[PDB]
């Protein structure tokens, strides 16, 4: 199936996922497609930060759902 991830204002990427994929797996697909290290990624769905070990299923993320990507960066 497919899910969407909001990045820049107004911009979305599409990802190829399975209901059983974990959050760490999704962040790996984001890194492959967008070049953002997984340790910098925080994913949000329906107002909740997603935990690396749970799966799209646990969070009730279905086809055409939309996640929001936030960058978590270290201060200088």
């Amino acid at each position: 199936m497919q899910i969407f991830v909001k990045t820049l204002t107004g911009k979305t990427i599409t990802l190829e996922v399975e209901p059983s994929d974990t959050i760490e797996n999704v962040k790996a697909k984001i890194q492959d497609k967008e070049g953002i290290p997984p340790d910098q990624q925080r994913l949000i769905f329906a107002g909740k930060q997603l935990e690396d070990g749970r799966t799209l299923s646990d969070y009730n993320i279905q086809k055409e759902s939309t996640l929001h990507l936030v960058l978590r960066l270290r201060g200088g």
Partner: protein, 86 residues
């Protein structure tokens, strides 16, 4: 669709509390984890002044005080709580 609104509301709260902002160049949402009063955007490499929630520099990049927070120009910090925004 209740999902979308819950996420919009969460982001609104993050912005209001100062826990997140939009990168002023590329408009991705960024959060700062630890460290000093500045971060560099991963997407576009813009330096961001966290304590004023805005760009550190003008369009010429690092060194360009024609815009940005102008920390220490004429000796004046960009914010009274600034310790180091680069």
């Amino acid at each position: 669709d209740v999902a979308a609104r819950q996420t919009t509301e969460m982001l609104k709260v993050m912005l209001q509390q100062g826990e997140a902002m939009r990168c002023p160049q590329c408009q991705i949402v960024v959060q700062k984890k630890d460290g000093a009063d500045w971060i560099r955007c991963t997407v576009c490499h813009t330096e961001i002044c966290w304590v004023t929630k805005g760009p550190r520099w003008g369009p010429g990049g690092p060194g360009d005080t024609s815009g940005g927070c102008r920390c220490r120009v004429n000796g004046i910090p960009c914010h009274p709580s600034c310790q180091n925004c680069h």
